[PDB]
Design a protein around this nucleic acid. Structure first.
Lengths: 206, 133, 81
RNA sequence: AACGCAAGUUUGAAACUCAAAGGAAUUGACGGGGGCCCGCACAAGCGGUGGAACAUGUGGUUUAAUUCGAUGAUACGCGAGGAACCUUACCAAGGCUUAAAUGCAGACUGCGAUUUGGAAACAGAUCUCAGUUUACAAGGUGCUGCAUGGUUGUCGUCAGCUCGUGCCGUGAGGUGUCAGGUUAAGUCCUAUAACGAGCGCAACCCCUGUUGUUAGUUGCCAGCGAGGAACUCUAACAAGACUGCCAGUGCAAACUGUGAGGAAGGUGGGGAUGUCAAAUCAUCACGGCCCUUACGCCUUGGGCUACACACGUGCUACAAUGGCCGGUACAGAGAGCAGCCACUGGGUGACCAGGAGCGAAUCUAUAAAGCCGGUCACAGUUCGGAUCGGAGUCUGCAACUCGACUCCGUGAAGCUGGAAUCGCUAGUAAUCGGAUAUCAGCCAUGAUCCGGUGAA
């Protein structure tokens, strides 16, 4: 670990923030609730492969805008499929709560859906060798010239740890104007825990 | 491989409007205090008014200017300018051994032209010995 | 950071909820010795970790760093001057 | 056995033991081999450490316990950026077993004040989201970072590390990446079985260094007058530095000087960082093993401060370019209802009572060094600050183990420190002061910053 987070040193630059709420010195419980809501959503609906939870905590309101990989099963028929989820998370955080479900544009380019799909294939234990190239090809079909998938130790049920590069294209991490999104999702297998890191380089922003 | 030097340009003083007095008080400074160093130098040069002006001080500063230094212990000329920094350093270093009362009092070594010429004499005696190099 | 030790803090916080008018009214104090504001040590409130705490965000340095890196606190950036 | 005076020459086995010895060449590593370069690396200069007293850290020795980890560079004022209880994970003793918290499973309904046993935890009574059985989990700062994920230090802000195609070599491999110039650089030109590409460098980012526009609230006070839109200022957008201008060298990059300019030749400083089975199973998660009348859990008291010795990191003093009583100025940033305090009264003092303003360019929080004047006129001193006795203030249930401050006593070691070693090239070192973080108080001399004076 000698590399800074690619989206870490980009906040005052092209990369923005996930949450959106300004509270003077009052982070506290407003941060604890934001930490519990994301994990509750990700545990309640994981088969939809959620991408992000834009949490807008304005006055007397909390918007929970969800970006998924499959909004069909989330909206459901008539809205009662959202009714139970909403009453659940609202009685968890008993305040005025609104939800907005967003549709996806090429779900193979999210830097987190790729990671969770590779992790699910790993924990399903098919080959460990087809998933990385599957993701690479399904991502390089379209644009986003750069994709880099790095995997951690405890591979193939071995004894010692080892890491694999498995990258191709161009990913200029040393350039702040590069639009590199990344998210670390790891698979909990029986031989331990295997870590996955996905970098996606779409293009320079202005 | 230092590749450069800048010599750190200076600025003269109000009294005596001389550029050597500034270097002297700069070598006299301690803990970054120039006003008290100027005060001590002025008291010293006014105490020296017993016997002329700072002319006698600047001529006594000449008797402490070596012409060759040893540095197989080979002798060599120092520089046309480092002479008046070795002279000032030697004067200020050996004026702090005088067991007088104040600094302006023990700085009365410009009239000793007295632990200042001894250094130049020893340097010359040690350089004339290793003359075969 | 054990469950019992972090629940002890919640128990002490719930204990210092009453007696707010009793401790406000050097003697005449027969208390359970837990109803005092000198025993409320601040945890990280997610993991419950002492030895490092920020009153603003209410979390430890490691969680603060990880969230500020992976974009979970609005406003934080990379300081440079 | 033959030859020779001898030293010795010629011929010449076996028992036993190993799965290897050996030649050529390749990549790396190394050399007290060579060549070309870089870095406060050395040479020069300044300030230190090692000498003295104090504060924390660690080793070592005792203790019922002195909680755990790192113990070269990359540990030792570190995790820990607040040990009286709490933190606390350790020790001694009182109280618990499906649990001191959390989900569940099947019943029985609509928090407070009083009283006893107590060191508390907990038991026994009045009274008016809570209380009680059964089988379930649960839990561990328990053991291995040599099973791990993640997250770091180091080489190292050094310039290196590879790939695609094509050619050479039987092959490992070689070329591109070599040779000559260029500088911070694998940053670029010249030719060359090489042609291109990726990571890295640079650029893209933050602050500071000038000017212009946009706007004057709670910046600010120049012209009239008794209220102003010019400046400082704040924060948005722009210009400005491109060796671009002028001189010489060169096919070329590119250096050596001058002129203009606020600036120079990456203006300066930061975020960026392409093997050591290295640190953490004590931020967190986790594969395997172990305990569950428990190595699990609630309490009181104690320990983490123990002390014959050592090494590391710091502060202060060893003095009169100094101390003291006095007058007189000049800031910045940051903080403030988990509070900052104007003003008045009591007290030498810490502080106490009354009481405005302020949730913040509005209100509060009073700098030192420096300047002027008098003293001391050289030594254990009018330097020094450890140690000890008595009397008070603040926090907190609690100040003995173990808080801070004030106050009246007192003046111990220390008069420039041994080989050996450390940091620094410009607003730098050195020195002085202020603020923030953990916050009931505090060990704060630690850590992170800012401002003043300012070198060789």
């Amino acid at each position: 670990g000698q590399k800074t987070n690619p989206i870490g040193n980009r906040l005052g630059i092209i990369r923005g923030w996930d949450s959106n709420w300004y509270g003077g010195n009052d982070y506290g419980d407003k941060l604890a609730e934001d930490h519990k809501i994301r994990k509750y959503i990700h545990a309640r609906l994981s088969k939809a492969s959620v991408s992000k939870v834009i949490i807008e905590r304005t006055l007397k309101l909390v918007t929970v805008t969800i970006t998924t990989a499959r909004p069909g099963i989330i909206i459901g028929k008539g809205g009662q499929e959202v009714d139970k989820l909403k009453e659940e998370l609202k009685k968890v955080t008993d305040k005025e709560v609104q939800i907005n479900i967003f549709e996806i544009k090429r779900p193979e380019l999210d830097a987190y859906l790729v990671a969770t799909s590779i992790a699910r294939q790993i924990e399903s234990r098919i080959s460990y060798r087809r998933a990385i190239k599957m993701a690479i090809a399904a991502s390089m079909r379209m644009n986003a010239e750069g994709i880099k998938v790095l995997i951690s130790g405890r591979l193939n049920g071995a004894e010692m740890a080892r890491s694999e590069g498995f990258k191709e294209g161009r990913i200029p991490l040393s350039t702040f104007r590069a639009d590199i999104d990344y998210a670390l999702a790891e698979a909990h297998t029986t031989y331990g825990r295997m870590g996955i890191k996905v970098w996606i380089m779409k293009g320079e922003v202005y | 491989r230092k590749r450069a030097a800048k010599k750190r340009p200076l600025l003269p003083d109000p009294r005596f409007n001389d550029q050597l007095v500034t270097r002297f008080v700069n070598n006299l400074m301690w803990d970054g205090k120039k006003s008290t160093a100027f005060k001590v130098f002025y008291d010293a040069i006014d105490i020296i008014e017993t016997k002329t002006s700072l002319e006698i001080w600047k001529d006594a500063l000449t008797n402490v200017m070596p012409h060759v230094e040893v540095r197989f212990q080979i002798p060599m000329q120092i520089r046309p300018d480092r002479k008046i920094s070795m002279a000032m350093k030697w004067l200020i270093l050996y004026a702090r051994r005088r067991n007088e009362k104040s600094m302006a009092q023990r700085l009365a070594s410009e009239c000793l032209a007295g632990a200042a010429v001894k250094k130049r004499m020893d340097t010359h005696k040690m350089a004339e010995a290793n003359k075969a190099f | 950071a054990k469950e019992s030790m972090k629940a002890r803090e919640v128990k002490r916080e719930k204990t210092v909820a009453k007696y707010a008018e009793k401790r406000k009214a050097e003697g005449l104090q027969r208390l359970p010795k837990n109803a005092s504001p000198v025993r409320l040590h601040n945890r990280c409130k997610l993991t419950g970790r002492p030895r490092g705490y920020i009153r603003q965000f209410g979390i430890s340095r490691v969680t603060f760093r990880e969230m500020a890196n992976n974009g979970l606190i609005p406003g934080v950036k990379k300081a440079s001057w």
